[PDB]
Amino acid sequence: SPVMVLENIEPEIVYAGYDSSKPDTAENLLSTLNRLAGKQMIQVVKWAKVLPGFKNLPLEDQITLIQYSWMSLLSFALSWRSYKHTNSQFLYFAPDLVFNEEKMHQSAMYELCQGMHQISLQFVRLQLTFEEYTIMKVLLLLSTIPKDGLKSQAAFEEMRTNYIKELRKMVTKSPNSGQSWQRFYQLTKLLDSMHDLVSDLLEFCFYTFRESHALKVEFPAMLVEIISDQLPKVESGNAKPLYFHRK
């Protein structure tokens, strides 16, 4: 069962290493978030390696997918942590870093934080299961490709199609009349709505990266590498977001 494998390979929670004794400025909160994103990205790479079917894809494509989807994976996992631990009342970045209204303001990311909070409120509305969540996160790893496609497009499409089949079989376990088509479309709609929020997070990311020292915001090595590669490709329009339902 691929879904049961997904449940067991889900990375363990990591601490942000947040310093509450230091002034709660935008530079210190953002630097803590960046440090946390760095650690979580190492976890994402180790998770992707043991993901069923991911090793079939060539190395270049595996890198491409991780680099295009990183923000989508981190934000989706944030929404899940927020839903599981606080019933989506707060943004649960880590056990030592839980954002309330004050931290959403101090981080200079209020509107972005509210946008993420809306996604977590959808988890409450839908009563999203862990089974669904784990399949959806794999679909997010496979939801952004280069405009001119991957080195092995057919291998990628076969992997993505199979995880779409997994999500469809999983929604049958949560029926209304006994129908599940409604839940499946609510899940694909929620997946599509990640692209727009992630487009805004990436815009904030890219700005803070271009002006990091002027803003006193630190970036770990993992992020420097990901962003230096992704910033030119995304801004040049070389990214192709994959939607279940075209806008």
């Binding site: 190492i42 790479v45 180790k46 992707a48 390696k49 190395l59 595996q62 890198i63 991780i66 680099q67 090595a221 993992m222 590498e225 990901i226």
Partner: peptide, 10 residues
């Protein structure tokens, strides 16, 4: 070798 390349191949 990049950090992503190192982690994926190790």
């Amino acid at each position: 070798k990049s950090l992503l390349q190192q982690l994926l191949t190790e």
